[PDB]
Amino acid sequence: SGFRKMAFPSGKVEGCMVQVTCGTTTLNGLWLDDVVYCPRHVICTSEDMLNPNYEDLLIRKSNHNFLVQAGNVQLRVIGHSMQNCVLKLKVDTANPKTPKYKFVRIQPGQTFSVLACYNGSPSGVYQCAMRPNFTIKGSFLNGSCGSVGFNIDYDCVSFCYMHHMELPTGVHAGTDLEGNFYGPFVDRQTAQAAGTDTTITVNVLAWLYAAVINGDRWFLNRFTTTLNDFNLVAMKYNYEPLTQDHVDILGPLSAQTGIAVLDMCASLKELLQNGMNGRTILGSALLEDEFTPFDVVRQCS
Amino acid sequence: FRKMAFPSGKVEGCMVQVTCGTTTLNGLWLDDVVYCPRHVICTSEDMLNPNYEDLLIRKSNHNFLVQAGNVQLRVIGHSMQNCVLKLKVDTANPKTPKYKFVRIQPGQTFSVLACYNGSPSGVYQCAMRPNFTIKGSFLNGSCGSVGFNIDYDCVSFCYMHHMELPTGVHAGTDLEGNFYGPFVDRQTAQAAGTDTTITVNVLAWLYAAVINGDRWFLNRFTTTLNDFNLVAMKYNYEPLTQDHVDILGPLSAQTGIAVLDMCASLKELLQNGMNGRTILGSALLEDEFTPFDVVRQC
Numbered sequence: 153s154g155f156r157k158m159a160f161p162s163g164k165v166e167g168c169m170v171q172v173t174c175g176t177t178t179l180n181g182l183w184l185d186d187v188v189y190c191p192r193h194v195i196c197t198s199e200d201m202l203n204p205n206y207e208d209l210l211i212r213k214s215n216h217n218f219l220v221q222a223g224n225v226q227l228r229v230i231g232h233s234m235q236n237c238v239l240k241l242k243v244d245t246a247n248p249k250t251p252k253y254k255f256v257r258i259q260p261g262q263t264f265s266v267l268a269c270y271n272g273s274p275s276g277v278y279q280c281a282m283r284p285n286f287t288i289k290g291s292f293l294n295g296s297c298g299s300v301g302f303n304i305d306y307d308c309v310s311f312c313y314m315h316h317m318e319l320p321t322g323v324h325a326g327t328d329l330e331g332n333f334y335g336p337f338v339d340r341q342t343a344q345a346a347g348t349d350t351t352i353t354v355n356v357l358a359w360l361y362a363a364v365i366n367g368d369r370w371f372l373n374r375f376t377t378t379l380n381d382f383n384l385v386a387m388k389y390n391y392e393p394l395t396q397d398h399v400d401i402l403g404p405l406s407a408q409t410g411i412a413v414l415d416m417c418a419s420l421k422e423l424l425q426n427g428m429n430g431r432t433i434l435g436s437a438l439l440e441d442e443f444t445p446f447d448v449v450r451q452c453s
Numbered sequence: 454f455r456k457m458a459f460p461s462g463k464v465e466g467c468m469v470q471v472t473c474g475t476t477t478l479n480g481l482w483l484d485d486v487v488y489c490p491r492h493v494i495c496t497s498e499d500m501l502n503p504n505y506e507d508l509l510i511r512k513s514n515h516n517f518l519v520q521a522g523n524v525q526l527r528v529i530g531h532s533m534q535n536c537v538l539k540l541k542v543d544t545a546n547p548k549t550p551k552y553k554f555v556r557i558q559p560g561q562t563f564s565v566l567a568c569y570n571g572s573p574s575g576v577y578q579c580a581m582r583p584n585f586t587i588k589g590s591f592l593n594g595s596c597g598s599v600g601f602n603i604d605y606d607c608v609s610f611c612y613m614h615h616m617e618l619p620t621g622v623h624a625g626t627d628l629e630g631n632f633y634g635p636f637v638d639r640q641t642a643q644a645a646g647t648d649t650t651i652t653v654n655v656l657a658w659l660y661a662a663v664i665n666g667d668r669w670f671l672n673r674f675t676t677t678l679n680d681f682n683l684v685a686m687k688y689n690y691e692p693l694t695q696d697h698v699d700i701l702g703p704l705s706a707q708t709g710i711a712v713l714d715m716c717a718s719l720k721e722l723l724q725n726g727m728n729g730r731t732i733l734g735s736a737l738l739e740d741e742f743t744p745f746d747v748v749r750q751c
């Protein structure tokens with residue numbers, strides 16, 4: 153197809169990874185300026201995890217109970233607090249590798265790079281999409297909690313995800329860097345179900361725009377639709393309804409190709425109602441939904 | 454189960470910009486030497502049949518502009534090794550990692566750090582195709598981007614980017630400047646040899662699908678190695694060697710599936726197809742995961 157999942161270069165995030173240990177429980181933390189951010193369940197013993205009282209568990213903790221290390225080098229903790237589901241450990245050293253950064257809460261459909269880490273050491277980097285049911289399909293093993301997801305704009309790192317858990321179906325759930333979970337999930341080791349997932353319509357449209365940019369445009373038609381009519385049809389095919397923000401982020405591709413967003417929606421609606429009929433788009437009989445409009449522009453330009 | 458690249462920070466710290474005339478690409482700065490594609494010294498009239506030894510002797514150290522960020526590095530020496538230019542600079546890169554230069558075999562995988570104007574832009578996994586192309590994502594100005602693997606803390610550089618072919622695939626050299634494949638750094642339309650599929654990798658990926666619960670493609674049948682290889686070659690799959698079977702052992706033990714039993718499944722898939730079904734999300738058989746890749750992630 154000419155498109156692959158491309159991650160952002162991970163070096164600016166690698167320089168922020170540390171490990172945080174309580175007792176024998178080690179996960180990863182994010183060291184920015186003089187604060188280390190990590191999942192609050194580092195303070196939980198295995199038996200605390202079905203039903204933890206995080207407030208009670210935290211009042212029993214002192215600064216000197218937290219082992220924060222950059223490599224083998226201990227960073228002394230001088231304060232601690234909880235914000236939603238993340239712990240903030242104030243340390244006595246400002247990280248000299250701190251990048252320009254922002255904490256952003258992304259929307260379903262958006263993609264981000266994950267730097268998978270174990271014991272504070274990066275293992276690998278890969279691109280993830282936030283599914284509409286607020287799960288991601290990561291590759292996360294024991295010890296991966298506290299690994300983060302990010303995008304990089306003009307040397308600014310926008311951190312959007314911190315890893316906390318795996319669901320029964322093998323997908324993954326976590327928080328933003330203010331500790332608010334994506335989705336309805338909670339950091340207790342109880343049985344939780346992801347909602348039935350749906351197809352990320354805005355990304356399929358981006359993919360159709362990408363096909364057009366590359367000269368593959370058999371599926372364009374002379375018709376249009378309203379956004380409401382399209383959304384009611386799309387839901388019958390387990391496609392996500394479009395938001396105004398979706399229409400907005402398709403703006404640049406619409407301008408580049410001269411195909412109005414709602415006209416492309418009409419082409420998609422026909423593909424959904426009539427199927428592909430043996431045809432392919434960018435080489436594939438199936439529509440890709442894990443490339444955002446930004447991803448497409450990044451790879452075509 | 455995802456394509457996972459190595460963390461790229463050790464390589465980012467080595468990328469610089471190199472300019473000659475109106476041509477700008479990336480270089481790799483290790484200790485006091487910058488490595489880059491020699492075609493940076495070519496113009497237009499040069500592009501179609503460049504006598505590089507002739508073009509290089511007419512250059513002076515000061516014709517080369519090397520920038521690490523916004524600081525210029527002064528070129529105090531230059532030489533050519535095959536298709537790579539080596540620019541000696543007066544400053545050592547303190548961010549130089551432990552490293553080696555390796556030439557990889559077809560079927561092996563590596564991470565690419567795509568860069569433009571000396572700035573890292575993206576990271577992704579590639580495999581060296583059997584026909585010695587790579588299916589990369591490279592635009593204008595990506596030349597000198599490198600591919601690499603990491604072992605312990607040692608960076609093994611295996612690829613430097615030079616060109617795109619009309620089919621959209623990519624070609625380049627090792628860090629000694631020798632091309633992978635029958636390609637030449639001249640501005641001419643070049644075709645690759647017929648590509649084949651990397652059989653040991655498809656098998657690794659089927660084992661990964663099993664580990665993660667996909668089993669619809671397994672079967673009771675068995676096959677000999679020779680008979681599997683007859684069917685493989687018929688479908689332009691690479692031969693599977695006994696070293697390949699040996700390499701797949703760990704994955705076989707973990708899943709309880711004999712290598713030749715998974716060969717029997719793959720034979721069935723090649724002869725029948727996937728019948729609409731998908732494996733790990735794909736309608737196609739994936740061949741850019743090595744056995745090591747699957748393990749290092751499972």
Ligand SMILES: *[C@@H](O)[C@H](C[C@@H]1CCNC1=O)NC(=O)[C@H](CC(C)C)NC(=O)OC[C@@H]1CCC(=O)N1Cc1cccc(F)c1
Nearest residue numbers: 492591592593596615616617618619638639640641642643
């Ligand atoms: C880096 O300098 C640049 C990287 C290219 C640009 C687009 N995508 C890339 O990966 N490489 C080049 O400028 C080379 C320089 C020569 C001196 C090797 N040229 C190049 O890549 O384009 C010409 C190539 C050379 C092999 C080939 O077949 N060919 C012609 C061609 C035909 C159709 C489409 C196409 F992209 C190239």
Ligand SMILES: *[C@H](O)[C@H](C[C@@H]1CCNC1=O)NC(=O)[C@H](CC(C)C)NC(=O)OC[C@@H]1CCC(=O)N1Cc1cccc(F)c1
Nearest residue numbers: 193293294295296297316317318319320339341342343344
């Ligand atoms: C943190 O490193 C770790 C990351 C896990 C380990 C394996 N893959 C991951 O993503 N997270 C945990 O161990 C969490 C911690 C609690 C305090 C949230 N626990 C966890 O993932 O437990 C299993 C999850 C908890 C919610 C749930 O429904 N559930 C059941 C489950 C699902 C799949 C597999 C499994 F063993 C249990």
